[PDB]
Amino acid sequence: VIGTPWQKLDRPVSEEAIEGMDKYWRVTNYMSIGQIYLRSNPLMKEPFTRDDVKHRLVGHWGTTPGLNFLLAHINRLIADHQQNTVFIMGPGHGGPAGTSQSYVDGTYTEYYPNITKDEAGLQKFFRQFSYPGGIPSHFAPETPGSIHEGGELGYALSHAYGAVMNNPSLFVPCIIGDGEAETGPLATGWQSNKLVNPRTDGIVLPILHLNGYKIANPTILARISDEELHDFFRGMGYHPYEFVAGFDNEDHMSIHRRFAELFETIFDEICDIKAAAQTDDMTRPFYPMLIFRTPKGWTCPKFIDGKKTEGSWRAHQVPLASARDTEEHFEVLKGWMESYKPEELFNADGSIKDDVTAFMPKGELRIGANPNANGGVIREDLKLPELDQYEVTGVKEYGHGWGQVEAPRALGAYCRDIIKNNPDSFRIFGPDETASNRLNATYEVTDKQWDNGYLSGLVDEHMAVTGQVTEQLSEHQCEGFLEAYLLTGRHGIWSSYESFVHVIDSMLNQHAKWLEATVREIPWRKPISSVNLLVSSHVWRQDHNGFSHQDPGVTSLLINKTFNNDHVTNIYFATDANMLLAISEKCFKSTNKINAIFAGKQPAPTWVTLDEARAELEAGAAEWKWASNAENNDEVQVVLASAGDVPTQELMAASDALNKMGIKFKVVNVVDLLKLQSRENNDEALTDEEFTELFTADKPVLFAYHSYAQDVRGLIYDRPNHDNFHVVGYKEQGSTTTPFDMVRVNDMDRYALQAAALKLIDADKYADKIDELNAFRKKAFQFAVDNGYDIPEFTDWVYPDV
Amino acid sequence: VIGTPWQKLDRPVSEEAIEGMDKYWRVTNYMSIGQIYLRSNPLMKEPFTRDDVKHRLVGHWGTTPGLNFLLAHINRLIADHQQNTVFIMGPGHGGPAGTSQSYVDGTYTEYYPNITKDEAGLQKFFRQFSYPGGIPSHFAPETPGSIHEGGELGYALSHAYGAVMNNPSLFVPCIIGDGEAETGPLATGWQSNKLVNPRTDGIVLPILHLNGYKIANPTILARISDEELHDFFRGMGYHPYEFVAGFDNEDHMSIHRRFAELFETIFDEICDIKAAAQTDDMTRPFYPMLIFRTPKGWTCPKFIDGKKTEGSWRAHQVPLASARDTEEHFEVLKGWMESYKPEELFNADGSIKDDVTAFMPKGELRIGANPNANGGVIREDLKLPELDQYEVTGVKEYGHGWGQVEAPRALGAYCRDIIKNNPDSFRIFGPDETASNRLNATYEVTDKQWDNGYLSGLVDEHMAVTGQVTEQLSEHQCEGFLEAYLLTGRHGIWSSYESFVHVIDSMLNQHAKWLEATVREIPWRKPISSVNLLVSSHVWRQDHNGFSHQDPGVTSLLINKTFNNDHVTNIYFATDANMLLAISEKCFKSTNKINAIFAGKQPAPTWVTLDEARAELEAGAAEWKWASNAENNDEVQVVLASAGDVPTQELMAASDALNKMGIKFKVVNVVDLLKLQSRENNDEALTDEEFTELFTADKPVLFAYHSYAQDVRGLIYDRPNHDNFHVVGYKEQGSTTTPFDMVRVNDMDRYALQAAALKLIDADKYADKIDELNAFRKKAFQFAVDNGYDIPEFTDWVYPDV
Ligand SMILES: Cc1ncc(C[n+]2csc(CCOP(=O)(O)OP(=O)(O)O)c2C)c(N)n1
Ligand SMILES: Cc1ncc(C[n+]2csc(CCOP(=O)(O)OP(=O)(O)O)c2C)c(N)n1
Ligand SMILES: [Mg+2]
Ligand SMILES: [Mg+2]
């Protein structure tokens, strides 16, 4: 347990602390300007000239001084209260404020020993910001203190809230851009306070950085009336406080006193809410939130070239773009840097004076050092139940292809027991789909956590104010919550109807990018758990729905994250429940990954034993020898290959029929897609020799793909025998229809697959059989049209093992 | 002008109208149940048995009766007021309520003559819903009255608002699911009332379908306190009204009277707001919104098998799943269908009685017939300015590769003049990026429309309460607004930083799917204008930003929409401003497309004349003969190929150097990407013969790709000479850095390209030159590290034409 959580001060903030906070604000303002403008001479020692100014001025001043003000006050708070604290920088383009924070708290020099606490260190600190060979413009994962970069705006609040889940001692002041608040994901973010519990979760404090402006526009929230703004936050279940500063001549020390006193009122209320929640954990409190209304660019020159800058969108990027080039602009920069009076903040050796930091928290309470902001230092392996107890045993008992098992129900029972063994560190998220995707065996040991109105046990099944499943009809919220949950060292999984995974494609992009930078160059940031996503209710079996719900293409997005042997992405196609089991265990042991686990939820055949799934998963693709009828690759007329539960069922029925015709083939199943890539693009892929062995050197390959055929084609482009692959995939065809018709209109049904294989073997010899199969598909459809359900030859076919 | 907009009644709703509305509600409820459950015997004529019930029960009852209630009342409204009305069905899974509406209003039989107004027609109407060979489960584009399917929830409000833009006579009651309101995009949707003007735009009426439940959960909004709920909507600038019905024994006619009176109060206030806005168009009114709180599944059996159904999430999907199979369940269905007393609603011939519809609007005011809900019937071609006036003339005057032109500024001037010539039907949307992407020449003729607080001319440039540019920091809002703007027959464009286009990938998915169904099978739905998206501030030149802003992969998403010769997607890589011009004109004339127009905003060389861009765009790819030094394909040692402004600059510098070494090559530029596909996948692509001519039959091809190399590889997989293409693309490498370093770390810089070409020609002969180039890249980087800007050999290189 870190510090002394939820303690009130019961005295005023000291005058020493106010003094220190103004010194912090002035030094972090100064060094943020230095990071942006200065290539050398950080203390402006004589001669200080244009030659000290960066050739390329890049970065973001506007948000930065308001961030630095808040961080002064949050730091002061942490230290007075000994409060376990992680902040979120929504305006992540304010990167100098987060690097300045770490540098002041001492963690920057601890993590980066070359960036020393003295003039030479400070020169390097200024130069290196947004610079070739240096550091990023944003609150990147290489910044001690960051679990959120804030490059792609809108995830401030889901991360803040996922971080405090099952973290009752943790306090998260979440700085949100007022421009950011215009995004979709941020707007639904506010509603998370109905989904956390004030006894078992920690506390988020939304701080709205209402600086009036985004890039080139005012913001919506800053320009509505104050009464609308207050009604807004009250209507979302918060107690709003508003702070206004910086628009008149109020002196800075007065501003600090007033803000500290306000911030103490807000914290006191948080402490009262925490204390009350130990007794009453059912009443949802009105959590405080802070509206912080200060000028953009605060403390910068009011006008530059006769244009309003402080208190404007003009302050957004880099004021004085000509500081290197004119001398008019350099004089303004010099005066600006001087107004912070650095001669009072730095010792002659260029170290930051002791009296600038005496007020700062220390040790692991420092914002840069809290282990919650590097959660893999506190992550523990899950206590996993043995997989074998979950196996579908039907394959051993009756044969390959047996039964009508709904595959995710095995993952559900497994997840149930993981929750039981790890009761406060493994969460399930679902956009109102947990049950729909068949993971509700989990409710046998816990509830959907819901901290909002209850009506009746006749309607309110499987929910309680505390629990380890969270649902909200928002994919951004599910993915945001989980990411931060993982980033602070815990574990879990979510699920989503496959076509709607795309809502959060850009979230997968950013978390994959966080993972990339991390495995490449941040060894101090320890491994976190993986994002585990069950992609179910797939393209082929969206029976109550239709075309809008048919889009397996998150595959294609994920493929754009597969470089440089990072290995931060995996795409798995579970063939049935036993494959699902094998994949899930690997996923739950893995770290530093996004894992997409595709499985169908419909009743379906089970193809492999558990032991077989384990061996196959390990290699990535496997021959199914019990299904091949050819002896060796020379005897093979076609390779029958599959990835996907329905492509597989269809390929298998086709193989049954090709067998009965005396065609000689082999069956290859593919589970781990990226392992089809060449070793040169992927050092963990099948070797060429392994690839050739599976797929032959010179025989045609019929490949039935779950998603767009383009994926497999681009992936195998430098593989031997690639020109022989015929890839059949989803091709934007379907509607509200029978299971047979869905595969039919994509040429994915068994008859079409058979026909395709014939065409590849000898189109002339089998012209007639092909026609006959093409017509049988037409007859099977008409039969569905006329009767309301699929032709029994189709529905009732079970694989000949049995 | 349609009907008599914004007229008050000044009398009570008639008793005849209340009577009709209850008949509408009862008949649409009845027929919605019929669509879901009945394969035959729609009037339950003796014998009515289980054999009449669908074998596969699929569909969504829960939302449906509340929709049917609202539609009764909106229909009654339209007719009393002669009000130009389009509705939005947010809960688009309530498809039977929209098909029932069209069937009652008469448009279904007009558009689908086989679905007749009599027993035989009604049998077909019931059977065909969610059925093989029939119609979709959702409010699909084949439903007269639909401009929004509501399959992927969350876009109800952006569409509602984009529809009323520059549409002052149009009224849009927007039905939003209370589950839908939990999504990100819906939550920011509410804020659009700060972005429309009540004089020059029409009026949206948000109706929150607060039925208490989503799929398997209660909803956030239904379970907070009523006071929070009211504060919420008031805080977003609405006047909230609340209607509660259905939870007691209040008789239905009383419910209709009470609701009609409320709905009249709401409309009166809308009429007052409209009338006031003719004089005061600066004061933002508090638009009405309606909280409609009724039981899910309303009028269904209260309990089924001892489980609460009406007033529960259980009502969500298909109550009585066993209606075919038990007889216990069939008796319940029969009683349920009977409670609507259809013997009072249908004539003996099975036509709907006249007194059920006498209250209904007629002609083009009918919900199914309004041309706003099929906007291509009112769409007109834009009055386009001549392109030649915008040409960058530098290419003709000084040579290929001249100048430092910021390409989109030509599109900006063009857009400026399009707005001038079409002042109320062409809009620009930008997520706070219009200026950042260089389209602000548009503000020369109009303003960013902003209907919210103003502070000062010192900060509030280029904005006014009415205008034809709209910005909000939300990609969902930009894309939603535009889609509906196009769907109701107008035109426009938006722009977005490239990596953030992904926020709305799933929106592109749905609108592409709308387009697909439309071109394939809905000839009555006329062509609308295309979605035009400028994809700028690209991967290669995100100078103030870094890794989070580097992701050109919307390419890959778009490629998953390129089937069956729909031609609903285009991906264009503008090489410079003249190519941009040529592409933009084609885009602005096109229909029924999503067009992604990639262009760099950085200062950059201009490569082609306008006339050349026109010829090249038409073919899709072109040899640049003035750049080739080889005579014919036999003389060619490598094909130098490009798609992208920066890949192109880099390839050109490489070609300059390969020339000087006496290497013989050709230069192919690629603008229209999908035209690289085979004719078999794309009937408008380059012929194999055209392809071979550009790319040779047997020579290596160096392909410098703007985005992920996987895209080109999968696209050319069946093209002749494909195994000779070496595709270099973005590979997840970069940071906050120099322009040279960004291309360097992706092996995309000129030296790397040269080296690559050498390797393809003779790796052994040029081992030394390759090493030398690899080292020069290392030296150029160190130079950037040491000096703060790129090596002059790199920066100052201008193409030898000049
Ligand atoms: C999803 C997304 N869209 C667009 C951008 C482009 N962008 C970078 S900062 C910014 C404006 C930020 O304004 P605000 O959140 O108010 O922050 P401020 O700098 O005023 O603190 C925008 C539009 C982005 N970062 N993320
Ligand atoms: C973006 C998205 N995510 C998930 C779904 C899955 N889904 C289909 S309907 C539904 C619940 C809808 O509830 P609500 O909006 O309250 O509508 P109701 O049927 O009660 O009118 C969900 C979660 C979806 N359609 N869209
Ligand atoms: Mg702001
Ligand atoms: Mg609902």
Side-chain angles (χ1 to χ4, degrees), chain B residues 312-333:
Chain B
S312 176
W313 48 277
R314 291 188 155 100
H316 182 75
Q317 185 130 255
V318 174
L320 303 158
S322 268
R324 209 208 225 258
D325 296 320
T326 59
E327 195 66 53
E328 282 51 51
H329 280 213
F330 175 74
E331 292 298 319
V332 175
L333 175 66

Side-chain angles (χ1 to χ4, degrees), chain B residues 660-678:
Chain B
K660 288 156 158 70
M661 280 184 76
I663 301 297
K664 246 88 261 263
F665 54 78
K666 53 176 326 186
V667 168
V668 179
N669 191 58
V670 181
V671 177
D672 184 347
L673 188 78
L674 301 169
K675 280 188 176 173
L676 298 186
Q677 289 182 105
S678 58

Side-chain angles (χ1 to χ4, degrees), chain B residues 133 149 175 257 322 565 579 596 620 662 679 702 740:
Chain B
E149 185 176 20
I175 309 171
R257 298 194 201 87
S322 268
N565 293 308
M579 195 67 77
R679 288 290 290 211
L702 179 57
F740 167 71

Side-chain angles (χ1 to χ4, degrees), chain A residues 524-584:
Chain A
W524 66 255
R525 189 175 277 291
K526 291 292 173 53
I528 63 181
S529 304
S530 287
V531 175
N532 307 302
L533 171 55
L534 179 64
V535 184
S536 196
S537 302
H538 57 56
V539 238
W540 307 105
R541 288 297 311 265
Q542 267 294 353
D543 317 326
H544 292 88
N545 303 309
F547 205 53
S548 64
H549 294 55
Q550 297 166 198
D551 192 322
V554 62
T555 62
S556 336
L557 264 295
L558 288 170
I559 287 160
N560 289 346
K561 252 83 211 165
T562 44
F563 302 97
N564 187 50
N565 293 308
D566 301 326
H567 310 294
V568 300
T569 315
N570 298 290
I571 301 167
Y572 304 105
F573 293 96
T575 296
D576 49 56
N578 289 332
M579 195 67 77
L580 187 50
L581 290 167
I583 297 160
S584 291

Side-chain angles (χ1 to χ4, degrees), chain A residues 63 177-180 209-214 219 296:
Chain A
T63 193
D178 58 343
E180 170 181 35
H209 189 5
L210 227 216
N211 63 10
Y213 296 95
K214 40 189 185 282
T219 55
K296 246 235 215 204

Side-chain angles (χ1 to χ4, degrees), chain A residues 182 188 215 217 314 432 461 471 473 513 516 520 550-551 556-557 560-561 722-723 732 785, chain B residues 131 182 188 215 217 314 432 461 471 473 513 516 520 550-551 556-557 560-561 722-723 732:
Chain A
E182 304 183 9
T188 197
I215 296 180
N217 278 286
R314 291 188 155 100
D432 191 26
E461 291 178 11
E471 303 220 288
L473 209 188
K513 290 178 166 305
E516 293 166 342
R520 291 169 195 181
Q550 297 166 198
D551 192 322
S556 336
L557 264 295
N560 289 346
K561 252 83 211 165
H722 61 262
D723 284 350
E732 281 305 303
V785 183
Chain B
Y131 186 92
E182 304 183 9
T188 197
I215 296 180
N217 278 286
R314 291 188 155 100
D432 191 26
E461 291 178 11
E471 303 220 288
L473 209 188
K513 290 178 166 305
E516 293 166 342
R520 291 169 195 181
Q550 297 166 198
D551 192 322
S556 336
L557 264 295
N560 289 346
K561 252 83 211 165
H722 61 262
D723 284 350
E732 281 305 303

